[PDB]
Design a protein around this ligand. Structure first.
Ligand SMILES: N[C@@H](Cc1ccccc1)C(=O)O
Ligand code: NA
Ligand code: NA
Ligand SMILES: [Zn+2]
Length: 866
């Protein structure tokens, strides 16, 4: 497998302007006819090089002449001696039933559906499968009417007919030129939820949600979320939908979350189907975010697309930013920000410290499917958010407007977007561009001084980014560094120097810098990196009392949560060191008191209280350490939970009871109270065994919604309560027929603290609700074990690694994309002790020797073993 490089980008020798597709559909053998109008832009003697994978060529015609001047090579059809303008006709055969990789045209249950991003269209026909080739598509679909009564593609229906022998056909046309990654086709039998949305300017849009027969009871929330998305994009961004129909198809077999195909989105059912007895608050909010995300791509990805795949963040960073802003506007901004920061610190920072580290705009890619990453998406969004921080909303919107005015109907680059922002706002983003080209997490170190003689406060701020495996050279970045200074009464001290106000967003642009503030009338308590204003690690020598002060007084709810995290971090580190020495948990009384105060504060938003009372995950905890001790981390998290449960027992029960709700509502105030109640339950489960068992079993049995039922079940597993096996069996007996619901149960099994967890997980490979054919099942059992049970995955006997090797040996052949997702915990070996490293290295070397090793795995393994 050969690496491709961003610096090698060159404009295509040929363009295709229009393509007419015909599919004679059948699960065993589908015949594709593709008629393309092509134009040569390159040298007269340049051949047309078409991408194709696993295609059976039938014929090649140029202007209806059977062509003799062509050759097939690895991954390509190379056509020589062409006119400047011509009609290309390709007929080829493909086999959807044989497609276990779920890229190109494949089978999902009884349905046929496509996934073309990034380079799946070349698994359908020989084409210029690159996103800078935009063409107007028409799509004719011919199929058995009984099996495939619905035949869907992008755009509007322009023709339909019936044929002999029980067949029928439907032809679609999409007026907007598109790259082939946005092509979609669906054929099957569905229930359909139909609704309408009228845009601001009066365009009526038909909304159509296609689900498997019997699933119509789980469709309305997704439809509601679509309408919410449409309305918000109008209100916030001034963007309206641009076609007449908006279709969404929910499919059970899907490697990713959802896909923004123009006017015909295809979604993993995990991000569509919800009812109050099947889906949690989290699920409802995830459906909202993902429905929003795909909708927002209509402008940021579809109307303006990517010149090449190295520009992926151009659409992903921006669209993630948009989905976060949507969720934050509609719901709790503080909770959204907190959760997104958790993801950045606990998951993205780990990736940036790994062999797979890359800039948000990669320079080198072997397998593009490996680059749909936390970095490209979540760090990409943080980079967009920094632009927003530097420009302000009004300037940012002017930049968006200029971006669309310049680039609508074209494929653009990350640099084009930055240039639009810079030109519209008059803010210099030259230095800022380094965020696109430099990998790794910057470390920002802050020292302060208060001078009582002059009433000046001085911040000395330094930055460095450690070398990463991909880049030996690192330089200073333009870091927006937001601050707020508090006096002894918790009041904000105006920022000023020399008789002039100073902006609270400091421009940290050098390796080391000094910022001086005047008229600082009291020694301040600083809030630093407010709202996580740049994606960096902060090094400041906090006292416990500065942090508890901020928990009490900080203006932004995010700062109060963040202060609690800093306070906890010190004691997590202390106690992991102690665990390694065989010593029990130690925690100062005043730390427990800070959390007691949060519980008893009658003014605090329950949404904030709930997040403060949710301990950092084992992944968040891991990023506090150079060398990760996963067993120590897991046991310290439990010990901390138990200690707080004991110290706060009375207060926890009081707040648990106070937040009882008889009515279940998917409404933000209700969600907040429920999140707080269940946060309290988590601690209560780790209290006195009898009370814990009674409370947990009662909640499970009395719950009128899945959020409360699952919270109880999770607590029973986490605390290994007496009722656990009974409750787990009850859930299985009730829900075994429902894969999405069973995913939650597989996750609980996989992340169980029980000594015999691996034995149980292995046995569950034979469970009635599990199958290796379904990416969701695989992720919920195997992925959850390796990624979310690091204590068990990293068992000292090496059993976790051996198990993953077994699974990856299967998945390498079956579904390389899912295999590559699942190998990630193994490429982190350099974060672990020498003994573990050697075992992990041995596992990787076994995989390296696999017959028919996928490019997907090859890329990760070679980086890991380097
Ligand atoms: N393009 C999708 C993600 C995706 C990529 C590849 C395959 C499937 C889905 C999105 O970000 O909205
Ligand atoms: Na809000
Ligand atoms: Na100081
Ligand atoms: Zn996206």
């Amino acid at each position: 497998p050969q690496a491709k490089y961003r610096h090698d980008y060159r404009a295509p020798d040929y363009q295709i302007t229009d393509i007419d597709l015909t599919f004679d559909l059948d699960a065993q053998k589908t015949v594709v006819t593709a008629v393309s109008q092509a134009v040569r832009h390159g040298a007269s003697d340049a051949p047309l090089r078409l991408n194709g994978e696993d295609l059976k060529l039938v014929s090649v015609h140029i202007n209806d002449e059977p062509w003799t001047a062509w050759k097939e090579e690895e991954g390509a059809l190379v056509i020589s001696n062409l006119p400047e303008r011509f009609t290309l006709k390709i007929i080829n055969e493909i086999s959807p039933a044989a497609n276990t990789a779920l890229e190109g045209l494949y089978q999902s249950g009884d349905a046929l559906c496509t996934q073309c991003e990034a380079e799946g269209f070349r698994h359908i026909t020989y084409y210029l499968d690159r996103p800078d080739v935009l063409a107007r598509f028409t799509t004719k679909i011919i199929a058995d009417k009984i099996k495939y009564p619905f035949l869907l593609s992008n755009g509007n229906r322009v023709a339909q007919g019936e044929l002999e022998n029980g067949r029928h056909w439907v032809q679609w046309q999409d007026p907007f030129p598109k790259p082939c990654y946005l092509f979609a086709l669906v054929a099957g039998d569905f229930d359909v939820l139909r609704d309408t949305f009228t845009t601001r300017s009066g365009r009526e849009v038909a909304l159509e949600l296609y689900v498997d027969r019997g699933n119509l009871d789980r469709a309305p929330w997704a439809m509601t979320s679509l309408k919410n998305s449409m309305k918000w994009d109008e209100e916030r961004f001034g963007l309206e939908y641009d076609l007449d129909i908006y279709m969404i198809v929910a499919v059970d077999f899907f490697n990713m979350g959802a896909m923004e195909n123009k006017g015909l989105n295809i979604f993993n059912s995990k991000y569509v189907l919800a009812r109050t007895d099947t889906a949690t608050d989290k699920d409802y909010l995830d459906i909202e975010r993902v429905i929003g995300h795909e909708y927002f791509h209509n402008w940021t990805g579809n109307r303006v697309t990517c010149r090449d795949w190295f520009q992926l963040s151009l659409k992903e960073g921006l669209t993630v930013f948009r989905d976060q802003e949507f969720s934050s506007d509609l719901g709790s901004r503080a909770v959204n920000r907190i959760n997104n920061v958790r993801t950045m610190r606990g998951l993205q920072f780990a990736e940036d410290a790994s062999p797979m580290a890359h800039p948000i705009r990669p320079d080198m890619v072997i397998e593009m499917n490996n680059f749909y990453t936390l970095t490209v998406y979540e760090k990409g969004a943080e980079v967009i958010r920094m632009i927003h921080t530097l420009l302000g909303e009004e300037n940012f919107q002017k930049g968006m407007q200029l971006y669309f005015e310049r680039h609508d109907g074209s494929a653009a680059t990350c640099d084009d977007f930055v240039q639009a922002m810079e030109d519209a706002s008059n803010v210099d983003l030259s230095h800022f561009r380094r965020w696109y080209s430099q990998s790794g997490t910057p470390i920002v170190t802050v020292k302060d001084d208060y001078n009582p003689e002059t009433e000046q406060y001085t911040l000395t701020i330094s930055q460095r980014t450690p070398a990463t495996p991909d880049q030996a050279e690192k330089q200073p970045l333009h870091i927006p560094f937001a601050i707020e200074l508090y006096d002894n009464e918790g009041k904000v001290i105006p920022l000023q120097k020399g008789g002039h106000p100073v902006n609270s967003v400091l421009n940290v642009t050098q390796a080391e810098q000094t910022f001086v503030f005047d008229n600082v009338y009291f020694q301040p308590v600083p809030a630093l990196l407010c709202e996580f204003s740049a994606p960096v690690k902060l090094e400041y020598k906090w006292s416990d009392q500065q942090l508890t002060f901020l928990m009490r007084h900080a203006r932004n709810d995010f700062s109060r949560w963040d202060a609690a995290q800093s306070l906890l971090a010190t004691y997590i580190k202390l106690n992991v060191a102690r665990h390694q020495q065989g010593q029990p948990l130690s925690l100062p009384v005043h730390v427990a008191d800070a959390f007691r105060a949060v519980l008893l504060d009658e003014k605090i938003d329950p949404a904030l209280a709930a997040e403060i009372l949710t301990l950092p995950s084992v992944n968040e905890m891991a990023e506090l350490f150079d060398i990760i001790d996963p067993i120590a981390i897991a046991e310290v998290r439990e010990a901390l939970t138990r200690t707080l449960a004991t110290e706060l027992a009375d207060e926890l029960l009081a707040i648990y009871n106070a937040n009882y709700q008889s009515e279940y509502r998917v409404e933000h105030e209700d969600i907040a109270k429920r999140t707080l109640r269940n946060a309290c339950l988590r601690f209560l489960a780790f209290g006195e065994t009898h009370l814990a068992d009674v409370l947990v079993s009662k909640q499970f049995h009395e719950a009128n919604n899945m959020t409360d039922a699952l919270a109880a079940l999770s607590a029973a597993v986490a605390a290994q309560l007496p009722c656990r096996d009974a409750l787990m069996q009850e859930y299985d007996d009730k829900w075994h027929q429902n894969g999405l619901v069973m995913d939650k149960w597989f996750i609980l099994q996989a992340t169980s603290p029980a000594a015999n967890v691996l034995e149980t997980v292995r046995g569950l490979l034979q469970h009635r609700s599990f199958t290796m054919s379904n990416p969701n099942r695989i992720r919920s059992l195997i992925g959850a074990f390796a990624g979310s049970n690091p204590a068990a995955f990293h068992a000292e006997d090496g059993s976790g690694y051996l198990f993953l090797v077994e699974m990856l040996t299967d998945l390498n052949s079956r579904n390389p994309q899912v295999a590559s997702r699942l190998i990630e915990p193994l490429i982190r070996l350099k974060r672990y002790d020498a003994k573990r490293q050697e075992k992990m290295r041995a596992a990787l070397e076994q995989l390296k020797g696999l017959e028919n090793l996928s490019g997907d795995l090859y890329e990760k393994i070679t980086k890991a073993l380097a």
